[PDB]
Coordinates of C-alpha atoms and ligand atoms in Angstrom, one line a residue:
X1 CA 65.0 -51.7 -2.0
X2 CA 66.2 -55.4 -3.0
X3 CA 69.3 -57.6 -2.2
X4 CA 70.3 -60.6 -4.2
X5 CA 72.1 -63.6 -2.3
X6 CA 73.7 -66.0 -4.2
X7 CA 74.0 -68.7 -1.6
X8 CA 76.4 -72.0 -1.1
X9 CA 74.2 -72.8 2.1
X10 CA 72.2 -75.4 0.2
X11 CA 71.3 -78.1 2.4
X12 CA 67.9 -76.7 3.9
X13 CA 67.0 -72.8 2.7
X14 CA 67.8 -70.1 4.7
X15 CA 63.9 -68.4 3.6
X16 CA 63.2 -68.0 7.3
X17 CA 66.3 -65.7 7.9
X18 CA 65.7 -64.1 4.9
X19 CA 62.2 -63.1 5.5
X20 CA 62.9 -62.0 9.2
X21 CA 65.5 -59.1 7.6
X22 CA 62.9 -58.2 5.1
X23 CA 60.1 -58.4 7.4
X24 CA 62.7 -55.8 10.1
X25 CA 63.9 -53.7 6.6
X26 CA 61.9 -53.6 4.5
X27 CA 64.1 -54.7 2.2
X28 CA 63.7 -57.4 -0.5
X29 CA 66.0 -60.4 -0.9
X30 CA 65.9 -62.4 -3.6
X31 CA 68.0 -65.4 -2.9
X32 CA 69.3 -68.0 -5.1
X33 CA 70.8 -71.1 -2.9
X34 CA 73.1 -73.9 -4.9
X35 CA 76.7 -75.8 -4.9
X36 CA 79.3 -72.4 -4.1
X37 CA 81.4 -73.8 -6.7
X38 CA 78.4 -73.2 -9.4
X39 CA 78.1 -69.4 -8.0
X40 CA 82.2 -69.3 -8.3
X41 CA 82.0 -70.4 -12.1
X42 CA 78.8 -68.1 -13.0
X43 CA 80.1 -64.8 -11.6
X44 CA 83.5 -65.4 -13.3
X45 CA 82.1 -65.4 -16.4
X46 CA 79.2 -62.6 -15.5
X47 CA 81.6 -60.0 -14.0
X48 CA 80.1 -56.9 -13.9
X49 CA 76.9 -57.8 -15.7
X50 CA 76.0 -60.2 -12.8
X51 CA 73.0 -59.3 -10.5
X52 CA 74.6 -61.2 -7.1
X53 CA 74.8 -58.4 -4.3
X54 CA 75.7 -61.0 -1.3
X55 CA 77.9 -63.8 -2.0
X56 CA 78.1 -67.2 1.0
X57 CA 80.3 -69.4 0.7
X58 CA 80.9 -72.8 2.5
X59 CA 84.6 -73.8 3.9
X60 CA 87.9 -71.7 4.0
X61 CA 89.1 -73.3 0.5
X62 CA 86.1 -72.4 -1.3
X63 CA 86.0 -68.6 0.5
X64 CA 89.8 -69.0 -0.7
X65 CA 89.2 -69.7 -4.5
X66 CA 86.4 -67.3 -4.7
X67 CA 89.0 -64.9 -3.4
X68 CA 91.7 -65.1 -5.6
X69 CA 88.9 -65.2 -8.4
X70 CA 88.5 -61.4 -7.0
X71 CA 84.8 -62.0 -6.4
X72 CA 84.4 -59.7 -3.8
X73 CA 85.0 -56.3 -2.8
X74 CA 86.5 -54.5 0.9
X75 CA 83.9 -53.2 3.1
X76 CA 83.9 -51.0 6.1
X77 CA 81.4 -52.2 8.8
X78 CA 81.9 -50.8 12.9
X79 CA 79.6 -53.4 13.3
X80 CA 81.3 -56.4 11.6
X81 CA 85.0 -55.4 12.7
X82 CA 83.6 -54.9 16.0
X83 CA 81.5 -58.5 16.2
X84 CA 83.0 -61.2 14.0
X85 CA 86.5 -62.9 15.2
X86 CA 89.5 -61.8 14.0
X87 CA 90.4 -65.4 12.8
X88 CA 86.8 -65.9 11.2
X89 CA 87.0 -63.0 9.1
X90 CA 89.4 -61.6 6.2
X91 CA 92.2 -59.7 7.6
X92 CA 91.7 -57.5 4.0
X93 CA 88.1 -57.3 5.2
X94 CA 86.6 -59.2 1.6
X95 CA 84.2 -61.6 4.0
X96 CA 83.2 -62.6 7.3
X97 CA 82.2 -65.4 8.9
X98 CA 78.7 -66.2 9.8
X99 CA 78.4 -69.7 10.9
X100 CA 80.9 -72.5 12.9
X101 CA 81.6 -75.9 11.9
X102 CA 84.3 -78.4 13.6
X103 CA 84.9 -81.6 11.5
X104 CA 85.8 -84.3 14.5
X105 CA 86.7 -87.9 14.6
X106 CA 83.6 -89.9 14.8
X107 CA 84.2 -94.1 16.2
X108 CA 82.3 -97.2 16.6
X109 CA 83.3 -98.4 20.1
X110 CA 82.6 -101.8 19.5
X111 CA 85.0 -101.9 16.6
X112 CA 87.8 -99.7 18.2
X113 CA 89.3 -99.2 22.0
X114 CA 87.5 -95.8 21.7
X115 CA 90.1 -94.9 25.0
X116 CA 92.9 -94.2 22.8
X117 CA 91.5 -91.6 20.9
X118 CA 91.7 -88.0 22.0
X119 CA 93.1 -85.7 18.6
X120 CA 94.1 -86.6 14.8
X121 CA 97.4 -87.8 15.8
X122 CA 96.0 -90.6 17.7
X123 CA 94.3 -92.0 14.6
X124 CA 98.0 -93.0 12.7
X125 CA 98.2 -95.8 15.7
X126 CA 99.1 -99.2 14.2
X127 CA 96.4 -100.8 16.6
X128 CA 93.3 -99.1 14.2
X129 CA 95.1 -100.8 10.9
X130 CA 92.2 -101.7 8.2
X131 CA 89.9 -100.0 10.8
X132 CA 90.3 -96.2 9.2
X133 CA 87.7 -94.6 6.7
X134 CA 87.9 -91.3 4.7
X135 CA 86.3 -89.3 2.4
X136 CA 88.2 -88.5 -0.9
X137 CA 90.6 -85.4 -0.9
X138 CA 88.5 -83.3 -3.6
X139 CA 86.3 -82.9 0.0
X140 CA 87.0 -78.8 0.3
X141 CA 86.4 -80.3 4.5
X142 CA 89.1 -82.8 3.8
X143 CA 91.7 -80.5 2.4
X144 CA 90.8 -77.5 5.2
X145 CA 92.1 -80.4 7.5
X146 CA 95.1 -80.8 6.1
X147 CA 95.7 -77.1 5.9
X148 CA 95.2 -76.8 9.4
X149 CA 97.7 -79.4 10.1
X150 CA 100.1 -77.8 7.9
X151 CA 99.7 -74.4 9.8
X152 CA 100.5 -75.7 12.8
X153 CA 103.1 -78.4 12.1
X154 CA 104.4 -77.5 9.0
X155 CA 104.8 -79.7 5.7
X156 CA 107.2 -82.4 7.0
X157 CA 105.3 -83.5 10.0
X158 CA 101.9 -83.0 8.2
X159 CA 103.1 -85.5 5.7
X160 CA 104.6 -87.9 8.5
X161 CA 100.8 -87.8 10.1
X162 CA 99.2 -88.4 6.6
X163 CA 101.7 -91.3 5.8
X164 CA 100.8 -93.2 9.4
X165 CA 96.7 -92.2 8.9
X166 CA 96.3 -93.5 4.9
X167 CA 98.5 -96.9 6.2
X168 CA 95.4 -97.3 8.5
X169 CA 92.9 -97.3 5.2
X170 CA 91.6 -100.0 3.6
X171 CA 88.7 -99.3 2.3
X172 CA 87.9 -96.9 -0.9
X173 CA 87.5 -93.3 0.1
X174 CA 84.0 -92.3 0.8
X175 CA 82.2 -89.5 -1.8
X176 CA 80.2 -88.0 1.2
X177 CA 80.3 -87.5 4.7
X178 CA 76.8 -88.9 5.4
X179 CA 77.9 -92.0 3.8
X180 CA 80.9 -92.2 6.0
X181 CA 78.7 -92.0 9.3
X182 CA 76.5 -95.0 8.1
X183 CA 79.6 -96.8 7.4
X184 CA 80.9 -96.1 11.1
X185 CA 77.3 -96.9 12.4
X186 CA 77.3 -100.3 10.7
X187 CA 81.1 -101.0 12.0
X188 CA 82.1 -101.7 8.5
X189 CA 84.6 -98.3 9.5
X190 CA 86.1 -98.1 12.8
X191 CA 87.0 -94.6 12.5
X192 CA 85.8 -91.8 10.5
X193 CA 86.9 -87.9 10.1
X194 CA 83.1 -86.2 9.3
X195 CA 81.8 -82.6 9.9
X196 CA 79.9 -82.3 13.5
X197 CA 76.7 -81.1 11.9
X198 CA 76.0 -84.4 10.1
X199 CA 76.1 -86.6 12.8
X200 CA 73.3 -83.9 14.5
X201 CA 71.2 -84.0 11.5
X202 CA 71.4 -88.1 11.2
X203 CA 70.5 -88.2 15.3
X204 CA 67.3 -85.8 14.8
X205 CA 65.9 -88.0 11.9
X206 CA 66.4 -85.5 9.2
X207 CA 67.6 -88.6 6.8
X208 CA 64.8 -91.3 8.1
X209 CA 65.1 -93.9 11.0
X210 CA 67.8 -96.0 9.7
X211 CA 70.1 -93.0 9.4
X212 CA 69.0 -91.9 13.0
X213 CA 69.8 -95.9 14.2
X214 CA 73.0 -95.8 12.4
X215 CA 73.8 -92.5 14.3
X216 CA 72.8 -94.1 17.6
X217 CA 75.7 -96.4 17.6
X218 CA 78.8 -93.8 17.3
X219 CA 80.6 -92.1 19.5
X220 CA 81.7 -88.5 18.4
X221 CA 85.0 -87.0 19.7
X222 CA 86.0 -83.6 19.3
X223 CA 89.5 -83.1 19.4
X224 CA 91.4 -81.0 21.8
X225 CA 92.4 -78.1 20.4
X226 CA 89.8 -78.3 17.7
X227 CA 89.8 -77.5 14.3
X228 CA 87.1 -74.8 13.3
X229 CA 86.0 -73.9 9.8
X230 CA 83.3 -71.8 8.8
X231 CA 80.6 -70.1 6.3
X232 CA 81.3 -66.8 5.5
X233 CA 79.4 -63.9 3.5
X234 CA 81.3 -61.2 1.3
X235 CA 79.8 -58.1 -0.8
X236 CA 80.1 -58.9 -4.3
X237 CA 82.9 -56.8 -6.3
X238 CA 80.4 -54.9 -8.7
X239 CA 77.3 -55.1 -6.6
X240 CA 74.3 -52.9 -7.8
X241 CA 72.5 -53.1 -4.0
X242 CA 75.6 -52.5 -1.8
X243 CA 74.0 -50.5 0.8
X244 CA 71.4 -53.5 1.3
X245 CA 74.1 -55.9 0.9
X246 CA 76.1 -55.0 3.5
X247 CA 73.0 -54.7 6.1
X248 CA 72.1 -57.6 5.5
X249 CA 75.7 -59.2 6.3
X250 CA 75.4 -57.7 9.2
X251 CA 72.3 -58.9 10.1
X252 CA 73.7 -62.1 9.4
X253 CA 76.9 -62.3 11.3
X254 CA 74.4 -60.9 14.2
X255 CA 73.6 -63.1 17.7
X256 CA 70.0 -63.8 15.6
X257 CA 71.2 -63.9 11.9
X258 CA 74.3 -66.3 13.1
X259 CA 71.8 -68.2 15.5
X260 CA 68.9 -68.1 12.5
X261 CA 71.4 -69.4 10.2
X262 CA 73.6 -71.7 12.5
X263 CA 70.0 -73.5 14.0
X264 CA 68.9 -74.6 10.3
X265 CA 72.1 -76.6 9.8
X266 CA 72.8 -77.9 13.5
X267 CA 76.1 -75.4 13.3
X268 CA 77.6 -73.2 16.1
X269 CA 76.9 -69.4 15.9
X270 CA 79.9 -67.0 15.9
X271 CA 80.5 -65.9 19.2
X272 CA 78.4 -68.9 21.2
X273 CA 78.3 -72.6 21.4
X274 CA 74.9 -73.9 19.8
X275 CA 71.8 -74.4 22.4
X276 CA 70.6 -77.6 20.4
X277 CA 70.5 -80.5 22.8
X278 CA 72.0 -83.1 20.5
X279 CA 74.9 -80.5 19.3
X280 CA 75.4 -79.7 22.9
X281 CA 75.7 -83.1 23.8
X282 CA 78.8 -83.4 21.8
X283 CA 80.7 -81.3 24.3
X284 CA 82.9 -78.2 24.9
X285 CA 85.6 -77.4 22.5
X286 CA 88.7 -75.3 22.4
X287 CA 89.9 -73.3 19.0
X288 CA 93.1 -73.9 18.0
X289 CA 93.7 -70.3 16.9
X290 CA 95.0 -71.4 12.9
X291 CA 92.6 -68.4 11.0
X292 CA 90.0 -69.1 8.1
X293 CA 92.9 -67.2 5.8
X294 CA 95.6 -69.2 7.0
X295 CA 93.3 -73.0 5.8
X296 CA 93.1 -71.0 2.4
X297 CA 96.8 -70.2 2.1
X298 CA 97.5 -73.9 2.8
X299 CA 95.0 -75.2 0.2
X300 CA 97.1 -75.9 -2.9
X301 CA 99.8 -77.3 -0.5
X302 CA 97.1 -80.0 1.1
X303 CA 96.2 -81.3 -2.4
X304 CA 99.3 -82.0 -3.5
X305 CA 100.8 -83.6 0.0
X306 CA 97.1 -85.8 0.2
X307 CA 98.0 -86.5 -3.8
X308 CA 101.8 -87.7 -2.6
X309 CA 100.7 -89.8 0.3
X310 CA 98.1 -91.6 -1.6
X311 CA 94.5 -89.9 -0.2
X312 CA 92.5 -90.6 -3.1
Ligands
FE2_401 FE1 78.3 -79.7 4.6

């Protein structure tokens, strides 16, 4: 019996997951772990002479375009219908969420009145002018954001908030989110929009001690309701292995597959806040109810307004 993961999660492998599910199964997994939109382009042009059995994927708009690419087939799982969120999980039933990420607003209180921040609509006040940083808009993270904004507020006062938040840029857009937090560290930003989990792995020295220093210095707010995006795992449309697939998604969207995998990257599991000190330190948050499908609906829409408005 074998399995074969073809894996977005990237960052630092997921081995020790895998091994505990083959170790409990019996089952083999051969994994392969690189950039989802490398997986996206290969299976395309494989179809049905690819060897992928288990597909992740990292944020809504990348779960989104490997969706309309029809990379994955409907499954029927007690377990997973039963388990995973409604709003972290394909209403059609394609994939399923497996990991929680919030991207907050992170600050440098000696650069900004820290006091005046609360949520993204905050961040368009005139006072932070030239004290705003971004990364660019081909960020899937970045454009998720917007998407959420639009579900909620619609297209009009989406681009209202975008218009008063890129007036409060100037300096060029960032190409990373790490980069982003050293920049807020240093106070060359005053404010930055960055995905919880970095700011974790800066603060437990994953990057070296200048990182962790930078780190130190900012303070991280999570807005109120929060903005919640995900990883999620789907069953690959012409899978050889998908008995052993699908067991193994389970296992994965799981209290110890979702706490295996959500550990490793300083994420939240599914259903539970993460137990890691430093992410715990960051505070409770509140979803605001906009599902994984609705950021993905939204996508094309938050390129083009973030195109308009001048998020570059
Ligand atoms: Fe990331």
């Amino acid at each position: 019996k074998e399995v074969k993961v073809y894996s977005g999660r990237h960052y630092n492998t997921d081995k020790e997951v895998y091994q505990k599910f083959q170790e409990q199964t019996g089952i083999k997994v051969r994994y392969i772990e690189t950039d989802g939109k490398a997986i996206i382009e290969r299976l395309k042009r494989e179809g049905k002479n690819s060897q992928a059995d288990l597909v992740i994927l990292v944020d809504a708009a990348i779960i989104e375009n490997a969706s309309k690419a029809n990379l994955f087939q409907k499954i029927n799982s007690n377990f997973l219908e039963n388990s995973v969120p409604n709003n972290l999980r394909d209403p059609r039933n394609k994939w399923f969420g497996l990991t929680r990420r919030l991207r907050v607003i992170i600050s440098n209180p000696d650069i900004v009145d820290i006091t005046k921040i609360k949520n993204f609509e905050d961040l368009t006040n005139p006072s932070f002018k030239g004290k705003v940083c971004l990364r660019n808009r081909k960020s899937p993270y970045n454009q998720s954001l917007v998407s959420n904004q639009i579900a909620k507020k619609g297209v009009g006062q989406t681009k209202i908030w975008l218009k008063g938040l890129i007036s409060n840029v100037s300096t060029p857009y960032f190409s990373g989110d790490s980069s982003l937090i050293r920049a807020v560290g240093l106070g060359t930003c005053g404010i930055g929009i960055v995905n919880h989990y970095y700011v974790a792995r800066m603060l437990d020295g994953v990057k070296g001690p200048r990182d962790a220093s930078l780190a130190e210095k900012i303070k991280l707010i999570i807005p109120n309701p929060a903005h919640v995006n995900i990883t999620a795992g789907g069953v690959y449309k012409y899978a050889e292995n998908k008995t052993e697939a699908i067991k193994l998604l389970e296992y994965l969207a799981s209290s110890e597959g979702s706490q295996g995998l959500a550990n490793k990257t300083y994420e939240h599991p599914l259903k539970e806040s993460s137990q890691n000190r430093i992410v715990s330190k960051f505070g409770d948050f509140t979803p605001d109810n906009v599902t994984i499908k609705e950021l993905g609906k939204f996508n094309s829409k938050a390129i083009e307004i973030m195109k308009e408005v001048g998020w570059n």
